[PDB]
Amino acid sequence: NVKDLKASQRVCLRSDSYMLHKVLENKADPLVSLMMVEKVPDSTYDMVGGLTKQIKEIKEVIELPVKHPELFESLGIAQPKGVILYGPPGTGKTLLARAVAHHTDCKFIRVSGAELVQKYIGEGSRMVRELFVMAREHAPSIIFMDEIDSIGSTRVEGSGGGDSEVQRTMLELLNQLDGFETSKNIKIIMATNRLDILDPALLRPGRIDRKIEFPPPSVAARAEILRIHSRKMNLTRGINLRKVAEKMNGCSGADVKGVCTEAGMYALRERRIHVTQEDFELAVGKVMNKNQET
Amino acid sequence: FVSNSEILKPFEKKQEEEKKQLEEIRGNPLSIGTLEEIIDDDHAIVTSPTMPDYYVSILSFVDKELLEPGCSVLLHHKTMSIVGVLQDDADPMVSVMKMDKSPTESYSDIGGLESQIQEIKESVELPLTHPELYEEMGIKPPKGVILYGAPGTGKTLLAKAVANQTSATFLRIVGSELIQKYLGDGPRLCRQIFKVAGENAPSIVFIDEIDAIGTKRYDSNSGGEREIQRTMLELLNQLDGFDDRGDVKVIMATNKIETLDPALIRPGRIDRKILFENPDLSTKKKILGIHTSKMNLSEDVNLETLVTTKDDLSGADIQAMCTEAGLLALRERRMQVTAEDFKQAKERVMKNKVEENLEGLY
Amino acid sequence: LKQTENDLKDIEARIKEKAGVKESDTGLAHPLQVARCTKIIKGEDAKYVINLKQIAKFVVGLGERVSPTDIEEGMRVGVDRSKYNIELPLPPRIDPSVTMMTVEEKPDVTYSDVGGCKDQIEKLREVVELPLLSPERFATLGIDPPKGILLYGPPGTGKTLCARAVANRTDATFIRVIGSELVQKYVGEGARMVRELFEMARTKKACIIFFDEIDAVGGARFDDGAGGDNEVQRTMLELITQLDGFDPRGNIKVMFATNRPNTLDPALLRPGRIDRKVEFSLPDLEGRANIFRIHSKSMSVERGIRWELISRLCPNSTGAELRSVCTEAGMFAIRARRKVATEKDFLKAVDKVISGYKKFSSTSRYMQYN
Amino acid sequence: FPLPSEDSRAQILQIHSRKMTTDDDINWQELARSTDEFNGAQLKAVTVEAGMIALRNGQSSVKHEDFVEGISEVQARKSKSVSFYA
Amino acid sequence: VACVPLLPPPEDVAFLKTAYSIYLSQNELTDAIALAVRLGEEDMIRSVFDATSDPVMHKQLAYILAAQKTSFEYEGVQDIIGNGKLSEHFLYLAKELNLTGPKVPEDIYKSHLDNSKSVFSSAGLDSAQQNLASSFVNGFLNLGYCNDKLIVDNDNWVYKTKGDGMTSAVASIGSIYQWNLDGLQQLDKYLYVDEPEVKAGALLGIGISASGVHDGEVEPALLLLQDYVTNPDTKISSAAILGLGIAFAGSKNDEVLGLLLPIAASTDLPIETAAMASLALAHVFVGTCNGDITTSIMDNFLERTAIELKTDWVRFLALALGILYMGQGEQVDDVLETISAIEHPMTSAIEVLVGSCAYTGTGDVLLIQDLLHRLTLAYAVLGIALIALGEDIGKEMSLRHFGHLMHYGNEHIRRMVPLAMGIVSVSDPQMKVFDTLTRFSHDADLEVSMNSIFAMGLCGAGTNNARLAQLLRQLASYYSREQDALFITRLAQGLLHLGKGTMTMDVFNDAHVLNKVTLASILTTAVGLVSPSFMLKHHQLFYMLNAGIRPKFILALNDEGEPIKVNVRVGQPVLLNHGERAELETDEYISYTSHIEGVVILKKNPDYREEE
16 A cells, blocks of 8 residues: 555566556665764773873763753753864865764764765755755764865865865854754764864854864884784784884874884784884884985 | 546546557657757657657647747657657756755844844845835835955854745855856856746846956956956856846945945945944943853853954954863863853964054044 | 646546547647657558657658658647748747746836937937838838947946836837857857847747857957857857848847947947947937936926026936936935925025035046047 | 948949939039048948938938948947037 | 634624623713614614713714614714704714715815825817717716816717717716715706707716715705706616605605605606616615605516517516515514515516615525525525625525626526626735636637626725735736727726715725615626616616715824824835824724724823824
């Protein structure tokens, strides 16, 4: 009958008459085209370090208006808005922002910035409300702006073209979830590297609360990934994470993963099952040679 | 029902028989095509991804008003002649358009600005629910309003409260995405917004922070970039070339519209000027005092202490000083905020967005 | 339940409508994109079968004789692709294909600025209305009415208001086509697709089309473009083609709109596609005294008011700028709650609107020649 | 296309004046001297707008003054103004 | 007061009997105006005003009272102020009588029209096709001011047209002198000379000014009716019956009934086309109790002789029985068993209209369900949908009963549909009414679509403009359909701009009672507005709408010569000043006994008193 027919269901149809015979299968498993939404990602507690001052700041950003928003109305204030996080190159900030959805009991939505810019008839104009429907379907989620973020050294994140239109889209989004919907369960976290093209219209007291700065690399910051990635990577007991880090330079979040990757390539020549401190010094200068270029 | 006996008797006899005549002209493919043009001889044009070729003639069940040039219709099973018509609803395939919702808004936080609040209400909210005074007087009311200054300080928040005071359909259209590197996308999507929405009288379209369009200088058409100047040329058709009965209303709130203004506004279609004003002692009390209606804090601290000596703190600046000081007190799980968080929240707001030109004396 | 019983006589008449279909029952079941039929079973050379599509492209050199006895099969035979004419058997040819056309009815606009338009509107009447009255004076004297005409000035101060007001008294077909959307992407979307409208103008008579937004079409070039504006410039040259070889000026009119006259291509502005130019500027004082009357015809005003002293406060202006004075004067009766329009409301409005409200943001030095 | 001279503009105006009915008071060398750097596109507008001046006067045919009034028609910005002349 | 016929069907009117009895303390005369009315017992009306100790309130007791119209203007109820104006027991003001009887108000309404000014009109011009239409709106635009001085300059007013269009003339320009006492001097100048057919329709413009002032006539109008009858061409006398018919609005008079009684007794239909006086008698007895008209109607049935073969005058008696008994309820019960006693081939198609007129404004389920089986019969229709004119709730349950007027295999049923929603909204516009207009005259039979453009002007009563601006200039291109169809278009523009556009018939009343005279003249025209419908009748059925036309009032007066600024929520102005028009909105400050819309006496604290 017509009461048992769900929307968007795979059924059977006759050849010439096209008559519906019976319901065969259900809605297809893959959704849309590219779905980067991930709940409880591979980063749970410790993946990218430096979370000492980061957890303290992000705790009052996401958790409070999402989990128990009634604490703000009881106090008399309103909900906060997206937060901007910036730091030094060679980090993995994009992977660091993916762990925000763990302790907050929500999901993580990633949106491509450069792919949002579209020529001809603008798709990104409709992709704003298309992702709004996806944001409406799942309330516990965090929408992220990618491809405008910083995975490393970054110069120009916006200009008179479509690059700066991604940040200008947030002007109508903050007005949609508040000046129109008057309900917002989703906080959109931004990212950047340096401060150049940000306009005073985008930075407002309560549109963007605080811009968090990440700590620069140091002796203790070079053992950041060394205390985590060493779990799944085979090493020996003569490996001192703090002492070997003293012989490195300019590698904290991103490049230490690359130095540990080059250490596996050196063990392939010896064809052994272990990697000692001798193979580390070969990857200290080789990785820095690529960073000193250009 | 009463008529199910007498009147229904010479009814259902021809009601079921015509349904069998429908099954003769319908079947169950019900192919959905597209009608390009109406012919007085009752003939149609088929459209489909399979590239159909048909001479099909327009059948009954449709009229001249229902048939539309380029909207989907139902087709016959074999001959593929037009039968029914598809009903449009939900979200059209055009650019981003809001449908409806009821916000909760009033005049509270922007209190003290009532000097310029009652001004915009005269040309917007009043000529809506009371369609009068234009028959006796005969002067056409203005269309939209134009606001230039710092948004979100209570000038744009004023427009957010007016949207609810209309008690009708409100529309919000994005004015950013038109600046795409593609040439010619600007004037297209803008025309289809006001043409399809012309059925519903209330619109009140709001746009925020357009810094691009409006390059003119000495001549009307220069040799500059075509991604900008031609996109504005569509707005001239809406506000001047083709004018409605007062349904569509365009509102643009940006930083400085000076150079932007006299390519669009025209003398008398839209008359409004609202600029950000430094609040006096009376306005600052109504802005900060009403924000604390639901807020709780130490009874030993006066809210007017920092009002006497302060530098340009609007409702937007107070929104953060309430949130920043609130998050510090909430860490200890207390609904009241101490006095130390009041001055601490004012410094970081004044030391960041608030900067003067260091122009003294004069 | 009107439609319920309307199909009772329509389904019975559907067979009568099918009686016309009974002529050709083959291939299952007048504007057309390209002429297409199924096999054309009906059809020197006798029968004529031609179709252009992805399958079985046909061509025939001869023609002009009766094979089909008027309509045949798919009913669509006639002008498409150009190059292709089936005339002799009652053609459905030269018909608008799939396209975007804006066609409205009765663009009613009243008089706006008569101050400097006294003899200026008469030049507009000599365009359209003149051949529709005494065409005999054209053949005897040897003169022809103006076709192309240019509108330059501030953006709709009573210039454009006069353009839409005169068109209402023409009592002909009105079609509005702009230049901003005209760009699009594909080559021919802004030229060949609009050429179909120009070709139909010679077919369907009593048509009037106002070309709008010529700044997005024409304009002068130095380095010959930065790219993407070539089709924008080719559309300018496509407009010349319709006026190049041949064209009647009786049923076809050309009118532009822009903010400055010479910003176009200096070769485009050359005469013969523009016979006369509309000079729109700030008229004199006493000429605009009728504007104050037009707005006060339907407006209640206190008897005894003196318009002589009111016009002295207002310097040289346009028709729309004078309505803004009465617009704010109408708002003086809203807040201050005036019964009628008084003299103090008008004397203050000039200093309130022009002096007080207007201030900056106006067109002054932006028109010289270029 | 070179700038037509006196005798060059005369032969061009003779083409568009074939269908024109005149009073035979026109001197071809007289009208060409008042014209400077006017191509055939601008010369054609003179003969067309000449009869339009006689339209309001009710004249049966154009005369030598009507061709001079064709210059008085507004094409090259020949119209009048204020100040130095009135 | 307004909730009486809400949950229960209106079986008893007893709720309207005792109301003011609560007000015996402070004497509230505002909502107590209409209580015992519509019954015909006026003894309880005079006892309501006998509690007044306030000499000042009598100024406020004029405008709110005399708005009662039908059940007020009866002899002695309208003069109740003039009865004690000499010897004053309650200190009834003598000027209040002139405020009740509309002798004075023509002066104060003319002075208030200078606030919004006006647009005058003249020059009926030419083109007899458009000339009858040119003078139709020409007379309605000038109401409130005398433009007729320019009309006298015209010599031959038409001279082109023949038939009844040449007959009725003064009626077009007679609306300028409506209610005007001093305008009767120039109005009587249209009697002598002119044209023989123009002189025939001279009385139809005279009776327009006598509506409602019938008790205050300075000259008797009974002799004016007989003067036009004694003229040659007795058909003129039948056309002069509706001349005084517009003036039938007023008290109950037996002098006009005694003269029209033998006219209907002549009974020659085919020769002079006369004896139609019984059709106009419907507006004579309204709101009172009398059975005299029914007696003369019964004796005209059984005849059906060769002279009575006319099929028109027989149908004129159907509408007269429903208007006389409308809203009464007392003598209606005796009529239900009266006419039904004698049976004729056509009987139940008439009398059933009287049974539906016992209660106006509220639908009766018993009467609607009983008439469904009987109709499945020309005048048996209107006694169904016209039962409730004030209730929109009954329309939602009757949506399938309105379908009984639309979709059938017979095309004659589609002819009567336009009057379903047109008679309800004729006083004030609504939302879903104007949406009914799509396609009418494009059908096969021309007689099916008539009231289409007619209902455009009827429902168009209201402010200066309406929602017809889309079809306003579109109807002007239909002149190629029918010759009379072009004048049909002007019928809509005339009612929109009637009385300078600000004067229309509406439902606004201080007693919350609909106008009986307004609904009487509208119901007087039921099947067809013109002659070519069915057989030949008359073209004179238009101007009868001028009987119940009176200008409304919204003004705050503490004294007749001392006005005060008002406040009304209407605007773009917002809280507009005195001397303008508004719609159903109250005021700000507090008056003494009322604080309602209309003329209300205010009061202020002598310590702090706001002065204009």
